[PDB]
Amino acid sequence: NLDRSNDKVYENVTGLVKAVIEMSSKIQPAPPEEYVPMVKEVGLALRTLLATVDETIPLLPASTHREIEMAQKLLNSDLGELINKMKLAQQYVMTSLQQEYKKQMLTAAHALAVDAKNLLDVIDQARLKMLGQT
């Protein structure tokens, strides 16, 4: 239903998900020289998203503020776990452990995306409560 024409939150979440996606479809054949920049993009997209959400909170019912702040915390956490696996992956480049580390990377990145989508869902519900839906 919602018009996304100027929904920056929805626009950033889309961007973060697309970043998590390009990183994922490109990870296996990639060297650390190619995937560190890739994670750096995911991070820039996440930072941009949280900034936007930070400016949107003031326009939403205070009753919703904490559920949003938690979803926000959760995301920084996922970037944390993703950055971690990325480092392990770098360390074990060229080793029998390189694959299990990129796989955990995909798992961290995917979780990040799932958690950004849920934030979009929490924030959409708070807009519905404001806009006054039946």
Binding site: L2, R4, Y10, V13, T14, V17, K18, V20, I21, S24, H110, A113, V114, K117, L120
Partner: peptide, 12 residues
Amino acid sequence: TRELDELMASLS
């Protein structure tokens, strides 16, 4: 969100 769902789907 139907287009964002094409994405959410890409990761399964």
